[PDB]
Structure 1
């Protein structure tokens, strides 16, 4: 009648028990708090699951409550100094022009609520309009490569760590932004 499933170790039949953890590599949107600057956060926890624990927790937050009109959106990065604006991230990737960015975030050009919600990020990234400069913000002229390293070998590793794919990370970040804004609209 014995069922097995245990390990005899120095006499005692020790048992491994099941452990519970939140699933990796999935898009979650949690509102931070009531009295906080951040009103919304898009988290994704990322590990390769073939390699052991390239733990990367990406937070794409949003600033300002319902009353504040400065709805600037930033995002965090592994090994980075602090949370940088999203348009600078897109210019770091293959997408320079404002509005081609929008095609990665908003999937119906007749959704003026979500479109209008996005305007202040463009002004946060008005002061950057080329790729070479987008990596340059990230921090002595090697920083760009450093940035690209963070963009390839650290940031969003649950896609890949090859330099060839940056459109995938771009569309996926746009999907994260879509989820975040779609929650912020109360939909």
Structure 2
């Protein structure tokens, strides 16, 4: 049975009558065994002169809301946004991508540290109730660690 090879970026053009524009997909799963562990699809919001800024909020595996990417970067260790660009921005000569990621910075600006970002993820993390902020952050960190890029680590 022929199946798509995993662990590859798959960016697709989402339908125009939809809040999503481009879906960066990767079936991030353990290379050895070639068995599915998880996957992730980052969806780009907004339009041109329509739909406000080009915000990016992706639904992590087993979370019940599209969480902004800058926020999960805060939750995953790099809370300052310049680190987020150092991870994203690699042709610094471009200004259009800077001004296009500005709305993402604006929306994730409500999150300014790893603790609030991890709690943000955990609230929507589809976990049980009464887990409280501590275990919520711990579970968000685990799900950012396990089942998120499991083929990486």
TM-score > 0.5, shorter chain as reference:
yes
Q: CA RMSD in A?
A: 1.5
Post-superposition Cα deviations, 1:44-71, rounded to whole Å, max 9, x if no partner, equal 0122133563431201110112332421
Counting matched residue pairs gives 142
- List alignment gaps of at least 5 residues for structure 2: 124-131
Q: Which residue of 2 aligns with 1:45?
A: 27
* Larger Rg belongs to: 1
Which secondary structure state, in structure 1, belongs to the residue aligned with residue 27 of structure 2? strand
Shift of 1:159: 0.3
Q: Is the 8 A contact 2:53 2:100 kept in 1?
A: no
Q: 1:154 aligns with which of 129, 141, 147?
A: 147
Aligned to 1:88: 71
* TM-score normalised to structure 2 length: 0.86
Tell me if structure 1 keeps the 8 A contact 2:70–2:108: yes
**C-alpha distance in 1 between matches for 2:16 and 2:80:** 35
Give 3-state SS (helix, strand or coil) of 1:23's partner.
coil
Larger RCO: 1 or 2 (CA < 8 Å, sep 6+): 2
Aligned to 1:35: 17
Tell me the TM-score normalised to structure 1 length.
Answer: 0.71
Q: Which runs of 5+ in 1 are unaligned?
A: 1-18, 161-187
Change (3 A) 1:20 1:54: closer
